[PDB]
């Protein structure tokens, strides 16, 4: 049905195909060239990173980095209420993910590894160089006690130094936003290869999912969920000694050059017969938008 193509925020209305309708001449809204609706087609595009090569420091740090961050999100879900179980049904509150990376299912371990690799490759394609400050930041295992019953079976508690001691700059928040953008785009392209397409209501048999939407249009709940996850990811990436310097805020306004067709402006004028050659005249112009 055609009602399934409505964008989430907008409401379905039946409006004139052309701009101008019947109204008062002084209330008539004169419109200029409208902007092109390129956003209508949600074509995700991740930043290309296959050509990029990982620097030596990150390629020998990542493996224990990858396992440590894996244990970090398994605690995040444990705090959220995740429970280990023999069965594979997450909705039934049973999953074998609590085990270590080696004991982890090979396909899950592979996922965690390309996502570590793609997070680092996105970090390095972001224009943000990262380097380790000192080895003491990794040598220190300053640890706060947490209840054993509330913790998992494994004695090694992945809970690192409390995150309040680390700080997140506006540039850090900016790169977290772009990293979340790239992760969303990659996931969307994955479902597109799977054959999934956008819909107003989720249909597993029809491969319809409302989340196949541009990130700015995405729901605030998944926005904040993925944003916080990548937030602890980046914060641990700093607390582990590796300091990173964001590119400075570069503001290059596009000035809305892109527009429908090649029209730059539209000119409105009275009829030539009303030309005034003498006298003193006055008329008003109202600016709806600056
Ligand atoms: N690392 C993970 N592996 C598997 N499931 C996860 C993981 N992290 C979270 N989940 C749970 O499974 C869901 C995975 O959905 P996601 O949008 O990431 O893609 P998907 O695996 O293709 O979809 P789904 O499992 O929902 O059909 C999450 O919404 C969450 O409930």
Q: What's the CA-to-centroid distance between 200 and ligand 1, angstroms?
A: 20
Token output for 162: 């409390």
Contacts of 73 (CB under 8 A, 6+ apart): 229
Q: What's the CA-to-centroid distance between 89 and ligand 1, angstroms?
A: 12
In eight-state DSSP terms, residue 99 is S
* CA 131 – CA 241 distance, rounded (Å): 8
Data resolution in angstroms: 3.1
Q: What's the CA-to-centroid distance between 120 and ligand 1, angstroms?
A: 21
* CA 71 – CA 103 distance, rounded (Å): 13
Q: What's the CA-to-centroid distance between 106 and ligand 1, angstroms?
A: 16
Token output for 12: 């379905």
Q: What's the CA-to-centroid distance between 69 and ligand 1, angstroms?
A: 17
Token output for 248: 């400075």
Q: What's the CA-to-centroid distance between 144 and ligand 1, angstroms?
A: 30
Which are the residues after which the chain is interrupted (C to N > 2.5 Å)?
none
Q: What's the CA-to-centroid distance between 236 and ligand 1, angstroms?
A: 22
* CA 242 – CA 86 distance, rounded (Å): 37
Token output for 45: 């595009």
* CA 287 – CA 120 distance, rounded (Å): 49
Token output for 196: 């999934």
CA nearest neighbour of 44 among 214, 176, 194: 214
**First CA to last CA distance, the chain:** 39
Q: What's the CA-to-centroid distance between 54 and ligand 1, angstroms?
A: 27
Q: What's the CA-to-centroid distance between 47 and ligand 1, angstroms?
A: 22
8 Å CB contact between 196 and 1? no
Q: What's the CA-to-centroid distance between 7 and ligand 1, angstroms?
A: 24
* CA 128 – CA 112 distance, rounded (Å): 22
Q: Quick one: the chain helix, strand, coil %, rounded to 5?
A: 40, 5, 60
Q: What's the CA-to-centroid distance between 183 and ligand 1, angstroms?
A: 13
8 Å CB contact between 235 and 163? yes
* CA 290 – CA 101 distance, rounded (Å): 58
CA nearest neighbour of 81 among 161, 150, 174: 150
Strand 129-132 and strand 242-245: the pairing is antiparallel
CA nearest neighbour of 135 among 281, 245, 241: 241
Structure-determination technique: cryo-EM
HSE of 283, CA atoms in CB hemisphere, 13 A: 5
* CA 237 – CA 132 distance, rounded (Å): 10
Contacts of 15 (CB under 8 A, 6+ apart): none
Q: What's the CA-to-centroid distance between 2 and ligand 1, angstroms?
A: 30
CA nearest neighbour of 71 among 156, 142, 180: 156
Q: How many residues does the chain have?
A: 290
Q: What's the CA-to-centroid distance between 90 and ligand 1, angstroms?
A: 9
* CA 158 – CA 235 distance, rounded (Å): 14
Contacts of 48 (CB under 8 A, 6+ apart): 125
**Cβ neighbour number for residue 121 with a 10 Å cutoff:** 20
Q: What's the CA-to-centroid distance between 242 and ligand 1, angstroms?
A: 29
């Amino acid at each position: 049905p055609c009602y399934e193509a409505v964008l989430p925020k907008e409401k379905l209305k039946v409006e004139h195909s052309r701009e101008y309708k019947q109204e008062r001449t002084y209330t008539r809204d004169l419109l200029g060239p409208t902007v092109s609706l390129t956003q209508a087609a949600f074509t995700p595009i991740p930043v290309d990173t296959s050509q990029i090569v990982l620097p030596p420091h990150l390629e020998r740090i990542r493996e224990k980095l990858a396992e440590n961050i894996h244990e970090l999100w398994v605690m995040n879900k444990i705090e959220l209420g995740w429970q280990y179980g023999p069965v594979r049904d997450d909705n039934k509150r049973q999953h074998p993910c609590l085990v270590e990376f080696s004991k982890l299912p090979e396909q899950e371990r592979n996922y965690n590894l390309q996502m570590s690799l793609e997070t680092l490759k996105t970090l390095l394609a972001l224009g943000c160089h990262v380097g380790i400050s000192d080895e003491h930041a990794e040598d220190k295992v300053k640890k706060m006690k947490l209840p054993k019953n509330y913790q998992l079976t494994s004695g090694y508690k992945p809970a690192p130094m409390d995150l309040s001691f680390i700080k997140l700059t506006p540039s850090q928040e900016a790169m977290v936003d772009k990293l979340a953008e790239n992760a969303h785009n990659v996931w969307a392209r994955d479902r597109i290869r799977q054959g999934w397409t956008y819909g107003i209501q989720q249909d597993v048999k029809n491969r319809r999912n409302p989340r196949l939407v541009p990130y700015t249009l995405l729901d605030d709940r998944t926005k904040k969920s993925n944003k916080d996850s990548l937030r602890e990811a980046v914060r641990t990436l700093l607390g582990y000694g590796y300091n990173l310097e964001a590119p400075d805020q570069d503001h290059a306004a596009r000035a809305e050059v892109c527009s429908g067709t090649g029209e730059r402006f539209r000119i409105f004028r009275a009829e030539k017969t009303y030309a005034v050659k003498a006298g003193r005249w006055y008329f008003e112009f109202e600016t709806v938008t600056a």
